[PDB]
């Protein structure tokens, strides 16, 4: 009716947005009942990068973790993948949006990180750009470990182990079941004939560099079996060094 | 009477943590309590303002909420879980909550039992 004329107007605002106070109709989108119909009129694919940051800034604050997750999954995350493929580097506002998306870590992990690695088509460049934001923003220990467990159980790709390393790089105290998944993750390549990248060894390095205190003799010697079958001229002696100078409990 | 009064509470708190049912602090302790979703109230005996205490007692009096009184708030920091822990399990962040308001319980056979017994002895 008349509401369709209001949002078709703001469609032409958000497509040419750069700065300033947004129209008040846009700021009350997650308060609506039929919000997904409204969002399609505004045309999220035709939006400017600057608009995308303030769009994310709205959804992260207005509660509802389930409503927040589905915005990232349908609008935000495709746009990130669209620009890394096109411009090869990410836009500033689009980057700033992702840091603002971490105000709800539950909706972040279930909407951005986990769906990205599950697709399989995730490139190395895509992984580092998003993964650096994990290093910048502090994440709750419960949510940090929960994302870490999924990636450990997940199918292996080059992009996948980058995230896993950066989560261990945070150096939080870990739940014990997560450690069991991480050991089982790396020991899954013990019989593998495939040539493993350097980023894989660095992930195994960071695991032993920090969490050598929480490794029992059973899994500790299972790791020494892993390096004996899948070696590296540079990094494998360092992991061998870190295991031999480890004090348990 | 297998478990004690100052032992079974940890289980209640732990279950609440697990099941997302802890309204700690001051405003979350109050605004959820008047929303009749919150079931219990725990208070610190060590206090700076008696007005706060009075308010708490009023809150407990109105919606028939049982009041538990623990000695120090700094002790309750261990009970709630507002401490940042090391790899071994060492606290380095010392913050203690004066009010611990319980929203949800875990379906327990011991803690809930002992606590129930305590309640029925009280009232």
């Amino acid at each position: 009716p008349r509401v369709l004329e209001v949002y078709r107007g703001v469609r032409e605002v958000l497509s040419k947005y750069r700065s300033g106070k947004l129209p008040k109709a846009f700021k009350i989108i997650p308060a609506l009942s039929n919000w997904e119909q409204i969002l399609y009129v505004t045309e999220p694919e035709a939006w400017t990068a600057a608009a995308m940051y303030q769009a994310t800034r709205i959804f992260a604050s207005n509660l509802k973790e389930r409503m927040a997750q589905r915005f990232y999954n349908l609008v935000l995350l495709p746009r990130v993948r669209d620009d890394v493929a096109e411009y090869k580097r990410l836009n500033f506002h689009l980057y700033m949006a992702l840091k603002k998306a971490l105000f709800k870590p539950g909706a972040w992990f279930k909407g951005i990180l986990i769906p990205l690695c599950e697709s399989g088509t995730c490139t190395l460049r895509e992984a580092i750009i998003v993964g650096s934001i994990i290093t910048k923003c502090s994440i709750p220990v419960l949510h940090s470990s929960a994302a870490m467990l999924k990636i450990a159980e997940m199918e292996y790709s080059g992009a996948n182990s980058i995230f896993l390393r950066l989560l261990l790089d945070k150096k939080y105290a870990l739940p014990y079941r997560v450690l069991d998944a991480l050991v089982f993750h790396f020991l899954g390549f013990r019989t593998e004939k495939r040539e493993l990248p350097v980023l894989w060894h660095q992930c195994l390095l960071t695991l032993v560099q920090r969490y050598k205190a929480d490794l029992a003799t059973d899994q500790k010697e299972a790791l020494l079996e892993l390096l004996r079958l899948q070696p590296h001229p540079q990094l494998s002696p360092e992991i061998r060094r870190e295991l031999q100078s480890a004090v348990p409990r | 009477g297998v478990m004690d009064v100052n032992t079974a509470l940890q289980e209640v708190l732990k279950t609440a943590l697990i099941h997302d049912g802890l309204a700690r602090g001051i405003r979350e302790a109050a605004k959820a309590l008047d929303k009749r979703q919150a079931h219990l109230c725990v208070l610190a005996s060590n206090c700076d303002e008696p007005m706060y205490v009075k308010l708490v007692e009023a809150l407990c009096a109105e919606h028939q909420i049982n009041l538990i009184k623990v000695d120090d708030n700094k002790k309750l920091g261990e009970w709630v879980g507002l401490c940042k822990i090391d790899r071994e399990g060492k606290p380095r962040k010392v913050v203690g909550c004066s009010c611990v308001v319980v929203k949800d319980y875990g379906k327990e056979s011991q803690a809930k039992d002992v606590i129930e017994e305590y309640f029925k002895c009280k009232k």
């Binding site: 105290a173 069991d180 029992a216 348990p248 | -």
Partner: peptide, 18 residues
């Protein structure tokens, strides 16, 4: 669920994965 586990000393948090 894995085979080789935590073995010894302390269980601070139970963790919610579900």
């Amino acid at each position: 669920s894995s085979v080789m586990r935590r073995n010894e000393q302390l269980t601070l948090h139970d963790e919610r994965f579900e």
